[PDB]
Design a protein around this ligand. Structure first.
Ligand SMILES: [Mg+2]
Ligand SMILES: [Mg+2]
Ligand SMILES: [Mg+2]
Ligand SMILES: [Mg+2]
Ligand SMILES: [Mg+2]
Ligand SMILES: [Mg+2]
Ligand SMILES: [Mg+2]
Ligand SMILES: [Mg+2]
Ligand SMILES: [Mg+2]
Ligand SMILES: [Mg+2]
Ligand SMILES: [Mg+2]
Ligand SMILES: [Mg+2]
Ligand SMILES: [Mg+2]
Ligand SMILES: [Mg+2]
Ligand SMILES: [Mg+2]
Ligand SMILES: [Mg+2]
Ligand SMILES: [Mg+2]
Ligand SMILES: [Mg+2]
Ligand SMILES: [Mg+2]
Ligand SMILES: [Mg+2]
Ligand SMILES: [Mg+2]
Ligand SMILES: [Mg+2]
Ligand SMILES: [Mg+2]
Ligand SMILES: [Mg+2]
Ligand SMILES: [Mg+2]
Ligand SMILES: [Mg+2]
Ligand SMILES: [Mg+2]
Ligand SMILES: [Mg+2]
Ligand SMILES: [Mg+2]
Ligand SMILES: [Mg+2]
Ligand SMILES: [Mg+2]
Ligand SMILES: [Mg+2]
Ligand SMILES: [Mg+2]
Ligand SMILES: [Mg+2]
Ligand SMILES: [Mg+2]
Ligand SMILES: [Mg+2]
Ligand SMILES: [Mg+2]
Ligand SMILES: [Mg+2]
Ligand SMILES: [Mg+2]
Ligand SMILES: [Mg+2]
Ligand SMILES: [Mg+2]
Ligand SMILES: [Mg+2]
Ligand SMILES: [Mg+2]
Ligand SMILES: [Mg+2]
Ligand SMILES: [Mg+2]
Ligand SMILES: [Mg+2]
Ligand SMILES: [Mg+2]
Ligand SMILES: [Mg+2]
Ligand SMILES: [Mg+2]
Ligand SMILES: [Mg+2]
Ligand SMILES: [Mg+2]
Ligand SMILES: [Mg+2]
Ligand SMILES: [Mg+2]
Ligand SMILES: [Mg+2]
Ligand SMILES: [Mg+2]
Ligand SMILES: [Mg+2]
Ligand SMILES: [Mg+2]
Lengths: 99, 92, 60, 60
RNA sequence: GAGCUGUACGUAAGCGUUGAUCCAGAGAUUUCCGAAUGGGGGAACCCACUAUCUUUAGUCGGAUAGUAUCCUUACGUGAAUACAUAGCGUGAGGAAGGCAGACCCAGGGAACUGAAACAUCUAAGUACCUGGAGGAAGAGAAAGAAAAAUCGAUUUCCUGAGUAGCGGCGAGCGAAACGGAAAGAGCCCAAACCAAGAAGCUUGCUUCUUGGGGUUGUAGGACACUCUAUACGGAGUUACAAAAGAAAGUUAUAAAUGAAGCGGUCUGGAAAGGCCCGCCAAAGACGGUAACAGCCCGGUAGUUGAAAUGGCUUUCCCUCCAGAGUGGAUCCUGAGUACGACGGAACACGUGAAAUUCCGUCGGAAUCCGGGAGGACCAUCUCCCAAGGCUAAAUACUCCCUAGUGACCGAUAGUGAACCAGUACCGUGAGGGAAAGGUGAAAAGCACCCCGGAAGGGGAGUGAAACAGUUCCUGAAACCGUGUGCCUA
RNA sequence: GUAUGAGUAGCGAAAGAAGGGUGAGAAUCCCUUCCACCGAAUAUCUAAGGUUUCCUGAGGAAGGCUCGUCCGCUCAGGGUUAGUCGGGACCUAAGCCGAGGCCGAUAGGCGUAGGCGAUGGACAACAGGUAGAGAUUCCUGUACCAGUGCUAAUUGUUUAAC
RNA sequence: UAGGAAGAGUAGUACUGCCCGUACCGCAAACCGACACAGGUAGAUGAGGAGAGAAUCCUAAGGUGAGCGAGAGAACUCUCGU
């Protein structure tokens, strides 16, 4: 996966195409990403110990990784990513000669 | 034989707690430990004076969760009674 | 793991015995119902295994 | 085990034809005789064929 | 290089950039049964002995190591029996069992069936049982093939050819050599002779061991002399003798880097689709992504990379080594064998005019002025030296691993088995042996209200769709119903 | 897979009645009284065999030839205590295995020493208590068998107690 | 008896004694019969009146009321009584 937890994201396709957000979790076992404010769902949950009043809950749902491009940190555009050896560790370098 | 590996765990239930005040303690032991290994293991671990040991062997019950029929584990239960002039064991 | 290899192969068995007593106490408490940090059992088991492996490697 | 200890003759198999050529199985056996000879360094009773005793042997 | 504690949701408790989970090489641990091996046993169980250590005041208990049988070989004891042998004990090596339902070598070896019946014959040396292996096995360096001339170990393929032959001359069985190819490779003993030991002393001999020599058909060798070489040169663990060690390179087992569109617009739940524009390409293989993607993701072409272990190839190291001529006086060249009679078998070849090869039983040669074969046999000629052994490649098969392919199947098909399948179930047992795939892009898997004990419904809500609500895509026919236009006692 | 026969045959020997209770629901579950049946058994133990069917708290989809609030059914927790009882560490019968051994195309067959093998031989514990589930086992009282150590006297020591 | 022998019994005391089975059914709805099946299943105990009796009828201790019912009282079929 080219996207990790804590990065900034621009969504490319889907019903919520064209917006931005910050990744909250990653599921590399199944190629899913959870981004705040994207792909909200309404869960009909019974009352229980969690959320004692129950009711309809409005929470995010995971989306596929391919629907996500990592925005350029300095300029602010989605871009493909490349790897360079800086120091003794591999860093991620954009296609606009950035980080 | 490394006494802490032939005494497994206490048995806590109404049947065991009812006799617990009779200075009788119920334990789980290995399926291979004998009546005297258990006695010396208890005396080594808890620093008591054992009077008797009784043992019994239990089969494995047959459970299921739908299409998956199997057997529970195999048990060996020991009731250890200590002498009158000896400190007790807690369990609590 | 490397904190063991500098011990003089005799206090390592003291460590093993102390760990065995701790593990027996942990099973005791778990069976009674007074154990809340159940994650310590696996840690103690693996520490015992580590010490035994290092000792066996010591004698080749 | 029923075999000569010098050469190695034993029973073999074949047919027993008749007039009208009706085939049928049978067997040919060696002329083994039980005699006493020095097998390795000591006398011993073994099976020896009559052909191995034709000229030159230990006893019988 | 950022999540992780499997399927498996879940709660709980935790661990991770001081680098976890994960992937590859090398190690450590490895309960009990099973060849099962200390004795026994109805599988995973029971009971021991001998030494050392250990706890108890002592019995009781614990830990560690050894203890099966047979073959080979050393040492010690040791009966009838005097020497001695058998037997007994101790030590050191080896074996035992499995399987890949395949391939192949040997021992034993059917019947149904065909002959329009059946017995010789066929099926067929097949099925099967037993033994032995090997990655291949078997065969293999002419006592050969053949004919007016020659070839030069074996194996496999194409032809010869359904020919010559065999055959109640019926049904049927059925070659080989020459010719053309793949692959190619040759060697080691026994015996004369020489040197040393001990022995029967078969007593001035022979007879065993050890080493050297030498292995062939124009005969060769021993034996004699002319020459050189004792490492000048040569060979090697796939035969030719055998066992180790290094250096380099390559390869197999994890991986790294890797170009170009968030292009505009229309429909749509969602664009990879339509229309109008760009670019990359040694990369337009494949798969995924909310419908059909070279330019979104994993990747692809190309270029890189191995700490560790294995394979392979060279080199070094190491080891081991005589080969030519001439005379051949005299000696050697595989004995109860080669053959022959009798009884069988294998040869395409069924006893036939029956050569060739093998087995059982009897008889039984010559040995270089010698012996065998050329489809009975004799004479002449031609070819060749049996009764000892070893040998790679070309060939057969696939339980497996890696990379791919298909005018191969698509859930009654394809493996019996796409799913907890040799399972459930059946049988005392050997053994026989199934049925069973699909919600949705994402659980967003229906909060809340009403009837009901519940199940199940009617709304509401999510969703593009609920006539997708947990046999859930599509949903035919048989079959069961409700309503009605025309007819019917 | 689904029909016709068809709401048809059958519902597997037998005496039940009423009053209370529970429950959404009662001929069928619980309690009471009366009646009836077996009684060399339809009673009490105990081998083989079965393998959790045993007990408690919940349950009513399927199983129960009807119903079910119930169950030998479903779910979750429990429950089997031995020096003296039956069997091993004791013994052998029929039979089975069998070092060497005899026999035999292979495989193997037979068999000596030796050993396994009860349905038989020998061997030390009785009476009460136990309100969810064990009792010659646990508990109470009184015993017996084999062995060990610690004390106190006794005796014997290589013509030699034992 | 052959053998082993410097320790031996005696009395009192305290201590030691291993493994396997143990639940429940067991003329039965839990075993063998595909079934909650009118069949089959070794042994010990097995009371009273009348009686020779373990026959026969009625009962004791103890155990049961049998896993479809109610109501009518036809033909015919089965098992019984005159
Ligand atoms: Mg017991
Ligand atoms: Mg024949
Ligand atoms: Mg083998
Ligand atoms: Mg026939
Ligand atoms: Mg025939
Ligand atoms: Mg075989
Ligand atoms: Mg070969
Ligand atoms: Mg033939
Ligand atoms: Mg790319
Ligand atoms: Mg487009
Ligand atoms: Mg679609
Ligand atoms: Mg002949
Ligand atoms: Mg012959
Ligand atoms: Mg001739
Ligand atoms: Mg010829
Ligand atoms: Mg001729
Ligand atoms: Mg050969
Ligand atoms: Mg289909
Ligand atoms: Mg199928
Ligand atoms: Mg069965
Ligand atoms: Mg789906
Ligand atoms: Mg509902
Ligand atoms: Mg529809
Ligand atoms: Mg679809
Ligand atoms: Mg239809
Ligand atoms: Mg009718
Ligand atoms: Mg009726
Ligand atoms: Mg009935
Ligand atoms: Mg009533
Ligand atoms: Mg009566
Ligand atoms: Mg009677
Ligand atoms: Mg039983
Ligand atoms: Mg049963
Ligand atoms: Mg059950
Ligand atoms: Mg019950
Ligand atoms: Mg019901
Ligand atoms: Mg019912
Ligand atoms: Mg039950
Ligand atoms: Mg007692
Ligand atoms: Mg006993
Ligand atoms: Mg007994
Ligand atoms: Mg034998
Ligand atoms: Mg025998
Ligand atoms: Mg005997
Ligand atoms: Mg016995
Ligand atoms: Mg008995
Ligand atoms: Mg007794
Ligand atoms: Mg009871
Ligand atoms: Mg009692
Ligand atoms: Mg009973
Ligand atoms: Mg039944
Ligand atoms: Mg019934
Ligand atoms: Mg019955
Ligand atoms: Mg009377
Ligand atoms: Mg009577
Ligand atoms: Mg009564
Ligand atoms: Mg009734």
């Amino acid at each position: 996966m080219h996207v990790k937890k804590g990065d900034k994201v621009k969504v490319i396709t889907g019903k919520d195409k064209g917006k931005s957000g910050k990744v909250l979790a990653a599921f590399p076992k199944k190629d899913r990403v959870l981004i705040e404010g994207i792909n909200m769902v309404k869960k009909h949950t019974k009352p229980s110990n969690i959320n004692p009043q129950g009711g309809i809950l409005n929470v995010e749902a995971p989306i596929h990784v391919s629907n996500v491009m990592l925005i350029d940190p300095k300029t602010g555009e989605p871009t493909r990513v490349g790897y360079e050896v800086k120091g003794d560790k591999k860093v991620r370098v954009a296609k606009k000669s950035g980080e | 034989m490394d006494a802490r590996d032939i005494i497994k765990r206490p048995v806590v239930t109404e049947e065991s707690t009812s006799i617990l005040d009779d200075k009788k303690y119920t334990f789980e032991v290995d399926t291979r430990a004998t009546k005297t290994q258990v006695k010396y293991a208890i005396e080594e671990i808890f620093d008591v004076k054992v009077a008797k040991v009784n043992v019994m062997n239990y089969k494995g019950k047959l459970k299921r969760m739908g299409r998956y029929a199997g057997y529970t584990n195999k048990r060996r239960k020991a009731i250890v009674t200590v002498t009158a002039d000896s400190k007790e064991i807690q369990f609590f | 793991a490397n904190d063991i290899r500098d011990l003089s192969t005799t206090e390592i068995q003291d460590q093993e015995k102390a760990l065995k007593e701790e593990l027996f106490n942990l099973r005791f408490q778990l069976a009674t119902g007074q154990l809340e940090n159940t994650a310590r059992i696996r840690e103690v088991r693996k520490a015992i295994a580590r010490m035994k492996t290092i000792v066996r490697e010591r004698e080749l | 085990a029923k075999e000569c200890v010098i050469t190695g003759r034993k029973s073999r198999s074949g047919n027993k034809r008749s007039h009208a050529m009706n085939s049928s199985k049978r067997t040919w056996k060696a002329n083994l005789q039980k005699v006493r000879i020095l097998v390795n360094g000591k006398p011993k009773k073994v099976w020896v064929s009559a052909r191995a005793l034709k000229s030159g042997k230990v006893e019988r």
